[model samples]
Target chain A: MFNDRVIVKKSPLGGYGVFARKSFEKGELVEECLCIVRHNDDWGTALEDYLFSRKNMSAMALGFGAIFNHSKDPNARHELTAGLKRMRIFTIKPIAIGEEITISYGDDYWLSRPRLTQN
Target chain B: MFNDRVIVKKSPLGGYGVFARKSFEKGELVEECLCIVRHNDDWGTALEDYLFSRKNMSAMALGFGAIFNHSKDPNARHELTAGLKRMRIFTIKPIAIGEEITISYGDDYWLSRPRLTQN
Candidate 1:
């Protein structure tokens, strides 16, 4: 789904990413998204390059919620729902309009991939 | 993705459906979700039983946004993004906690199928 509060835009950190359209107060909601929840994890497939891994399962988030890029200093954090079927994102700190909404990446999944120059 | 303002719950109107977990004021945002946007459209597929069709394209929404039940009198409405890859739901009327978040559906797609009794 979409929100005027957020937009899909090019990120200085990488490819298509998420940006804020309005300022958000600390801990205010930013995004609510769903995903393809699948059980039975398997290793060595391309989708594993991203997506949250928890409870021995993986989620394929279909919206711009997952489109937010990673930053060491980030404004947002995500939460998987209690049933593990969907996810939500919130502003961990205050956000300004036009700022990229990024969540911290726990793994350095991009460490080995050829860098795209973040253009 | 998901939000505390809403939940995937058993709808008195249907099976798995959306309901308000928190009160919402008019025009407040309810959901933001993405979908599988297909360029071509064909008739008679089961999937065609649902999904929004526009610009000769059809979308397969991937979350509780589409799981909302239909009501002639509804509390929410949906908008496809400007580019049409995602959708957002907004409250059209004030909604109270425990109210089913229903959207008006067009085309009477269910007229031909046996009703599930909304159990």
Candidate 2:
């Protein structure tokens, strides 16, 4: 039910990425993924923990929202809505069919990623 | 620096509400508020605690984001983005000028509000 507007495919940036199934106008709502809240201790990895911090809680975005890779410049942006319990991905600019949709993971993420590699 | 797209006014639902300063199309970006992270213990009241929860931390939205009141159905929705360091409010449906922009605070909030009143 959640995969109709987009699909997971190999990304040039790295691993799998979410791609648009149809053209979308700028600012269009692209996808909504329900999140399951968990405690911070329950998270298995730093990546999982980083992606899902929710007000002293941890959340897992259940669909393509979790799989969409990051870009410094992105065609899409994700917003945590529904009392920060769900994430909605929106197009920042118009996107064409077959184009990979990407979102920014913020400056802190890039700074943190290098440490992960060093360790 | 803020207060361009929305203004805080006396609310019918309660004390104050956020109102649109101009018309916005569906999915248009409305406002972005930088949040100051604080400990849960730092929060002054139950309302303060409820609005800003960021994964074992509390946050205060520095702009109109915090003033927007709740509606069972809303014309706008707030999304926690920028690694949950900032909140971006967006129009879910088209909104007219002078309209009070509202958001859904979720089932958990409604359930929790009664307790605050009881106390």
Candidate 3:
């Protein structure tokens, strides 16, 4: 259910990330992550650092999973399906349409080793 | 502009996330939120938990909104302006540099008496 190889553009490191109107495979699901507001409370233990100190926290992102484009060694994988509130992000294998889906920006997890640059 | 503090890395959840290179301040427009492909056709009423169920859901993240770690109720909020599709994540209060961002998975909604977990 994904389209647009590119056109909504505007994301140096903030928003917009849709490139690959064609080319997607690996585990391929590539669409469905949406959430403008969905919280049940419990922002503790640094819920991913307070959602990156929110301002919308990427607008409660869940769609396009914020457009994958980081890859340290990633094919893909962002799971979350207990009650079906949603939050998946697969691939983990063959993604070659234009190939740019990434994820790991969980502050790169205090990085011991992470790589993706274009400043 | 901000510099690099770390490299892109693999997220065990399944991909990558980046770290702020230098530092950021509050009440500042660090960077305008971006989008990969903002939709207008509408995914439906269940949209909140709808998008998060993708294999590339994390990829369509619009951009880096995925970076905001997580927050429960310290401050900051996410609100869509609609149409033009410019995304923004703001400080609900005063955020300092090196702040880790975050958001709750829509799935976490029914947690019942919800409380952040170590998981």
Candidate 4:
């Protein structure tokens, strides 16, 4: 979901970030994406490794549109649509232009372990 | 040097992620990059416009590796690979497994400015 955000060029956290066209209220819908590639060859190996070890996922999902890194105190968050290979990036709170957008890598507890097959 | 860290497959911040296998000390070297595309057609136009207004680098270096966003207190940082087409993402400190990575969009002043040159 792209909108009329200013798209003003700025020193993005790492790259160019889409700035807010104006102010946005909290819990606003900022961005969304459909899964361009779902059953990938790379996904299996990486997924298996993560489950076997830390029970986490890779930071950069190769062959994906754009790898999105996680932030503990993020400006953005996402939810996987049920029965679909898509995710939506939504704002947790109001945001102003020039504010960096962020999302949690995952919920805290889930990321810290590799105990798969249990739940 | 990719290490023996575990790759888990839990709900990642956005996608799959590479997690730490153990604890790390602070101020450790986490990641780095070498510029791949220096003189892109997009550069001149984006640069000029940025300088004409808010002087700063663009987020998500298009056609570059994963796009990086700026963070107020990022967990990581980067410097131009120097005379090369690269940008490295270095951690400010040791990060634990599942710890989300972050980096400032750019220095505060530069990000908030539309003025270029002089300094």
Candidate 5:
């Protein structure tokens, strides 16, 4: 539960993120994400560089839900259950007051980005 | 830094106890006692049951360090360094393998022990 609303700071889309210290409507319930499972032989694939799979297993999210970043177009939306334990963050629309909460790191992370070449 | 040298188990004394899984030298560094610093405002007297006083400050010790039960004539001892920063546990005498590790809870504790009533 985000008691102080939320604030992690410093992220122009790089290091850290997660903002919104006030206004939030559309769905509300801005957080409830706490994790730390990490089984499967102590986590494979180099712990997926800090983990966050869910359903299929593996976790490590804690507080501010592991620093919310990546945004394909997100106001905030995370809801994983099943073996990954639990996680919930809503407000999939109206979110103002200092905004900057994002999501959508899926679709294989935009199919593994790193494009724009041709030189 | 006890690796797997210690294990928590049901203690005959009360709730839980930390026991040695292998031989430890008389001056072995059984644990480093990491703690979460809690300010005077956040933690007052009620926090004493679960916290150990360090350099006149308050802290929530994590890991096996917080589980060791109290013993008047103990086999182990702990050294707390300034500002409640670091803590080290050492064996004051030969501690046999499997022996439960313990430390004195201080003079005030014994001085306050309820005496037998005359009745």
Candidate 6:
């Protein structure tokens, strides 16, 4: 149902990305996915980039969770919901339908990850 | 906007499952997630159970992609959407709000996996 509001398509920045199917206002609930708590199986693979690390085991946000690209100057941001088992990826700034949605995987991504795409 | 129609939470069958937020008619789009084409990072980890393999490397459905449980008598079924980059988890039978959704990961799973929470 909400997929009508967002789409997954090619991103000029790099791999596929999430774009709005409809425009969004600032601080709107763009899309949210339930987190699946995970730990292993993420080294030296394309999936590693999306497996967010944590003090405990890392958290995997399914659905469009993997489609958002990274950007320090991001138009959207994600917050760990109450149980830290859900992520609410919301708009930090106004976004138009054709605009690509982005998030920061935190700064460690830039400090360590090299030779990659949108960051 | 439609996360209200589904949820990922503890499943008595095993781990977590996608439950309907509202009742659904048979053959309706219960929940769907865009798939991310993937290959590695799935050997001896919990992630492997959810990674659906194929003729190519494999497919990684982000979002609620990882939350559906398995059952031969599953009330829900998933179809690889066009372009093979999205999964539409639809209902094969009517489902109530609290009913947990399930799918058959093909017969190969029952033939291979020795121990699993749900089968």
Using Cα atoms with residue i matched to residue i, what is each candidate's TM-score against the true structure? 0.34, 0.31, 0.27, 0.29, 0.33, 0.35
lDDT-wise, the better of 2 and 3 is: 2
| CA deviation > 4 Å runs, candidate 3 | A1-119, B1-25, B30-44, B48-69, B79-81, B84-86, B92-95, B103-119
Candidate 1 global CA lDDT score? 0.47
Give candidate 4 misplaced runs (Cα > 4 Å): A5-18, A32-67, A70-72, A79-87, A105-119, B1-119
Superposition error at B111 for model 3 (Å): 34
Q: For model 1, which pairs clash? A: A1-B32, A1-B33, A1-B34, A1-B87, A33-B1, A33-B2, A34-B1
Per-candidate DockQ values are 0.09, 0.02, 0.03, 0.02, 0.03, 0.13
Error of 4 at B71 (Å): 42
What is the fnat of model 3 with respect to the true interface contacts?
0.00
Ranking by TM-score: 6, 1, 5, 2, 4, 3
In candidate 6, list every pair of residues with a backbone clash.
Answer: A62-B62, A62-B63, A63-B62, A63-B63, A63-B64, B5-B21
RMSD of each: 15.0, 15.9, 17.0, 20.2, 18.2, 12.9
lDDT of 2 by residue, B8-113 (tens): 5532345455667666556545553332333445232311322444345444342333454344455655655444333556565666766776554332211111
- Model 1 Cα RMSD, Å? 15.0
Taken in order, the candidates have interface RMSDs of 10.0, 13.6, 12.0, 14.7, 14.5, 7.4
Q: What are the Cα lDDT values of the candidates?
A: 0.47, 0.45, 0.33, 0.35, 0.44, 0.47
Error of 4 at B42 (Å): 38
- What is the lDDT for B6 in model 3? 25
The sequence of per-residue lDDT tens digits that candidate 1 reaches over residues B5-86 is 5665532344556666665455455554433333443321212223545445444444543564344455565544444333
- What value does the TM-score of chain B take for model 5? 0.47
Q: In CAPRI terms, where does candidate 5 land?
A: incorrect
Candidate 3, residues B1-119: lDDT per residue as tens digits? Answer: 13343232223455333323323333322222322322322322223222322221221233344443333432333323233223443332333444443322222112123121221
Find the 10 residues in a row with the least total lDDT in model 2 chain A: A110-119
> Looking at candidate 2, what is the lDDT of residue A32?
38
**Candidate 5 wrongly placed segments (more than 4 Å):** A1-119, B9-15, B32-49, B53-66, B70-73, B79-87, B104-119
